[PDB]
Amino acid sequence: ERIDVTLPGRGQLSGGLHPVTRTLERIEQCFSRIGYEVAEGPEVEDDYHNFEALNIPGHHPARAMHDTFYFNANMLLRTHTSPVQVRTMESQQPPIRIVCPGRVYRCDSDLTHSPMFHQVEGLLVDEGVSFADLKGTIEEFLRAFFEKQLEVRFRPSFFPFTEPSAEVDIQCGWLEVMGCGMVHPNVLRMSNIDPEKFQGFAFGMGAERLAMLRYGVNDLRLFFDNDLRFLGQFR
């Protein structure tokens, strides 16, 4: 007699996270499960931590106002999360195993590029670290991240803070997804780490680029509009 139908439930239901937050968490988890510590730093940085300490000379185009956001001559908005890795290298002696997710800023203006975005950088500094160690780490990361036993390609590239350096491609006939390299001797030396005793590798990736690859997002501008019609798709 007291029968009822199976209509929707009463009350409030779950919302959700932002796709970048989902992605950042995921990248961190691939490394934190194997000994890496999550390191954070300030978003308003100095020339030293952001550029000088990373072997970027004063006359380097990256330092110009066409690319970097400045407050005064020495204070800026960090162009990458590497200053966090610098602050870690100064504060302690090896072993260092860290992952650095965070908001980063660049002057480059419209469509394919936003003035604010997220990136995850990594650093491992120990006694006997090789380029072989780096290849393995990166290959297994991308496989874990994209949940596929995909093909990973290493192309020789260049960065002032690493030597040798590589641009990393995955299939789907190839897609560039991240960069890495062996920490430059001058970078270690500057942060009081003997390049004779210690070797290290470091890597970097854009979180938005990864999220777009993962979720099929076409326009990068959708990430900062916070339209519920967008956000809701990631519950």
Binding site: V5, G9, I34, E140, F230
Partner: protein
């Protein structure tokens, strides 16, 4: 294993204090469970001799005694009923300090002077014997301090032995360890062979030599069993928790506790034509010394004569063959019984003795002879008699033999995380009586002594070295690992995630017993045979649960009976579905709720929880991995639930679980006067979800239209909502049921479903004509499928 420290130190003296010794024992693998003084503290008490007693001329209960301390004669008044001339007793002189600050003073008891006091064991905190004066041996040294004579400056140390240290089930065993621990000399009791006084023997036959490769027998004639066990032996046995029973048993127990060799004495008159060590015949009956009538199995080794079984070998003797008061002659036995052959045999007959324990753990295979000589000397000393020669029957082929073990220094360094010196390795192993011979560089050939049954591999030798070096002295390292980045799939709802969601949704986590009452099981699962335990703790914990609900409901009503109104519980764990063959052990997430929808508060409505509150909780769980649309709530039925308020939850037709109100008839039966809402989900069906697939956002406005639909009261709302999506075309972005009306304004068998429909084109604005066209096709479809009408 309990023992007197004084007695242990008489074999191996570590030159450290009691506290240091008790500390080290646990640190080397002999965990001390207790260390206690043997007696209370006192002074001024010596061995006294009663020379004469006279009747107190003014008190009948009292005696006037003349007592000697070896130097002087004192008059002491005694009231104890056992006080008599010739008695050796503890004499507490004027000046003596007894326990609980009792100082002995001069006394004039009923006109008679008393220059001391004669003591009971109780008065001295020796025993609880206050029955009278502590009677001392006739040969006690009169004048000597009673603490010295009775060795009262001592402790009993109780060690909780590990099953591998059967060799430490004796003073001989424990003293060998101390000598190794402390690298000190070991002085074992010198056991001289007792010469035969005659040639009387009894034949011995080893009919099962693999179970008994050595058996020693000895005839002892004309023993006086009326004689007492000496005090030194009673105290040594007592300090090992062995109660004194009779001289012969006392000696065999003493020999076992001293040397580690269990022994047995038979009444020689009860032996018909020699000993036969053999297996029992199946169903052979034997009455034990404790009266138990055992029905034997062919796998059990017995000590038999040529007529019948006399004892269950190495466990317990028979009543008939054993010593009694009528015994005049003995047949002593000391044998080695194989550990494997004896394993679990006492337990299978419901028995456990000091002998069964020692033989199962392992008794030194070479020990029988030394023990036989020791027991002979003690028997002749305690009860007299004449010993015959020892009959030793041995099977050289079945004696235990452990092949030498090769120990490599590099394997010690690897394991310990540090190198030990060759000299330290050799010293330590030789102390444990292992035979160490060099076998080149950083290698030895090590032989195992006959008392050790736990040493057969190189790793056992490394344990011995680590143990004696000191575990806490060893280095600390963190294991190396070639670790690679890894992760689980993104689109999955794991149980830790789900628990936290239920926590956020106002649930408390319960943990209930996996085994329940079969009666309770039958209420929730009628007609199903539970997977029943063979040996349940109690009868109401016999059935393996097929649902988390009986446990959840019971915990719910436990709280309801404890002044709780709002009980919201969840539990995760296994289900047990089927019998052993085909058993399913599936992980479940189940929840149970009752009382007010919201906690009591000024801002909160006072409505009671219902089906749709529990439904929202299930919906939230089901949507955790972005796969909510993969699930469907279909009207179903469950015997534990109300048939009018039950939803069967499915995914691709596969059963996920159920959600519903606990059946009112089940509630009656449990005396539950509140409505209760239950859900149970198969986690294997909930965990997988889908990764977000981006769908482009329109730069154009959305159009909404509201429909008020008259349908039969019984047609399900989701059937109407599903039909709407099917008939709404490609541009529907949202469908919402914002109201249900079952009032007076319409037919009593109909209901009004107020639905909001939203459309958005990705590339343009939508015109009214097409939206009105789409709306009319929805209506027409609902007329032809459910005979729907617009309000």
């Amino acid at each position: 294993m309990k023992f007197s420290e004084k007695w242990l130190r008489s074999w191996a003296n570590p030159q450290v204090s009691h506290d240091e010794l008790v500390a080290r024992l646990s640190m080397v693998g002999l965990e001390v469970d207790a260390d206690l003084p043997v007696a209370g503290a006192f002074s001024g008490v010596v061995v006294g001799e009663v020379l004469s007693t006279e009747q107190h001329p003014d008190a009948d209960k009292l005696r006037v005694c003349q007592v000697s301390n070896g130097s002087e004669t004192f008059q002491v008044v005694c009231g104890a009923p056992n006080v008599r001339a010739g008695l050796k007793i503890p004499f507490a002189m004027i000046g003596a300090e007894l326990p609980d600050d009792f100082k002995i003073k001069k006394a004039k008891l009923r006109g008679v002077e008393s220059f001391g006091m004669l003591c009971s064991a109780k008065e001295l905190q020796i025993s609880e014997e206050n029955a009278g004066l502590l009677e001392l041996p006739a040969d006690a040294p009169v004048g000597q301090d009673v603490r010295t004579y009775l060795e009262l400056a001592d402790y009993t140390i109780e060690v909780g032995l590990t099953p591998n240290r059967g060799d430490c089930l004796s003073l001989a065993g424990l003293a060998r360890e101390v000598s190794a621990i402390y690298d000190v000399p070991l002085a074992p009791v010198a056991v001289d062979a007792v010469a035969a006084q005659h040639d009387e023997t009894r034949p011995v036959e080893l009919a099962a030599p693999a179970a008994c490769p050595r058996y020693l027998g000895r005839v002892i004639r004309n023993v006086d069993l009326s004689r007492p066990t000496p005090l030194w032996m009673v105290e040594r046995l007592r300090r090992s928790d062995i109660r004194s029973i009779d001289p012969v048993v006392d000696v065999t127990n003493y020999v076992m506790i001293e040397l580690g060799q269990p022994m047995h004495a038979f009444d020689l008159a009860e032996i018909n034509g020699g000993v036969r060590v053999r297996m029992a015949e199946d169903g052979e009956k034997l009455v034990l010394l404790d009266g138990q009538e055992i029905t034997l199995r062919a796998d059990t080794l017995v000590i038999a004569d040529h007529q019948r079984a006399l004892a269950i070998a190495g466990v317990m003797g028979g009543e008939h063959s054993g010593v009694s008061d009528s015994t005049r002659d003995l047949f002593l036995e000391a044998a080695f019984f194989d550990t494997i052959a004896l394993a679990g045999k006492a337990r299978s007959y419901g028995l456990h003795t000091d002998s069964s324990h020692r033989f199962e753990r392992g008794v030194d295979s070479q020990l029988a002879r030394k023990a036989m000589e020791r027991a002979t000397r003690l028997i002749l000393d305690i009860v007299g008699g004449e010993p015959g020669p020892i009959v030793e029957q041995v099977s050289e082929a079945h004696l235990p033999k452990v092949a030498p073990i090769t120990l490599r220094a590099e394997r010690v360094t690897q394991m310990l995380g540090m190198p030990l010196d060759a000299a330290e390795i050799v010293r330590l192993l030789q102390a444990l009586e292992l035979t160490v011979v060099a076998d080149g560089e950083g290698q030895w050939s090590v032989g195992v002594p006959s008392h050790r049954f736990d040493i057969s591999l190189e790793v056992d030798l490394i344990e011995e070295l680590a143990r004696l070096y000191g575990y806490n002295r060893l280095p600390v390292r963190y294991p190396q690992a070639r670790l690679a980045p890894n992760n689980k799939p993104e689109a999955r709802a794991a149980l830790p995630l789900l628990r936290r969601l239920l926590v956020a949704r106002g649930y408390q986590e319960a943990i209930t017993f996996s085994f329940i009452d079969p009666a309770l099981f039958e209420l929730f699962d009628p007609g199903t045979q539970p997977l029943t335990l063979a040996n349940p703790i109690s009868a109401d914990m016999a059935a393996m649960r097929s649902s988390l609900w009986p446990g959840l409901v019971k915990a719910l009503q436990h709280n309801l009976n404890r002044q709780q109104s709002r009980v919201r519980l969840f539990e995760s764990g296994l289900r047990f579905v089927g019998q052993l063959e085909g058993l399913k052990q599936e992980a479940m997430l189940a929840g149970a709720i009752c009382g007010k929808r919201l906690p009591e508060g000024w801002a909160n409505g006072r409505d009671g929880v219902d089906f749709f509150d529990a439904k929202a909780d299930v919906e939230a769980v089901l949507a955790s991995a972005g796969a909510l649309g993969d699930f469907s709530f279909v009207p179903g039925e469950h015997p534990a639930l109300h048939p009018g308020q039950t939803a069967r939850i499915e995914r691709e037709g596969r059963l996920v679980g159920y959600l519903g109100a606990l059946h009112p008839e089940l509630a009656k039966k449990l005396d539950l006067e509140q409505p209760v809402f239950l859900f149970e989900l198969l986690l294997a069906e909930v965990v997988d979800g889908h990764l977000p697939k981006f769908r482009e956002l329109s730069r154009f406005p959305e159009v909404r239209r509201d429909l008020a639909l008259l349908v039969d009261q019984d047609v399900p709302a989701q059937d109407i909502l599903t039909q709407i999506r099917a008939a709404a075309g490609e541009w529907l972005t949202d469908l919402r049921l914002f109201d249900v009306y079952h009032g007076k304004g319409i037919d009593p068998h109909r209901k009004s479903l107020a639905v909001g429909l939203t459309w958005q084109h990705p590339s343009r604005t939508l015109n009214d004509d097409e939206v009105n066209s789409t709306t009319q096709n929805i209506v027409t479809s609902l007329e032809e499928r459910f005979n729907a009408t617009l309000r």
